Amino acid sequence: SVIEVTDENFEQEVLKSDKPVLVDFWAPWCGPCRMIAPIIEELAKEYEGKVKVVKVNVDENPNTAAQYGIRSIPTLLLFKNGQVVDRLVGAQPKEALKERIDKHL
Ligand code: NA
Helix, strand or coil: CCEECCCCCHHHHHHCCCCCEEEEEECCCCHHHHHHHHHHHHHHHHCCCCCEEEEEECCCCHHHHHHCCCCCCCEEEEEECCEEEEEEECCCCHHHHHHHHHCCC
């Protein structure tokens, strides 16, 4: 359910999306990232039609990571209309994530 996005297609997939986009910045070495991965996948299902959910591997896409100030992972960015409207740093429980996301729908 969760599209993997890279430096190459970030602009098209995230910035030019027709709906808000939740972007999960992660890497294989990150323990907490692996913890939230299934949460993100399940949230993609719940928000089908309302929010697009994508993941970006920061090891493979350091440029996008640097451009958006991703100084630590996990970090979730919520984009709307091509701009960051929320930044969620560190692991957070499903309900806290939903309330933050809901606020922007
Ligand atoms: Na973090």
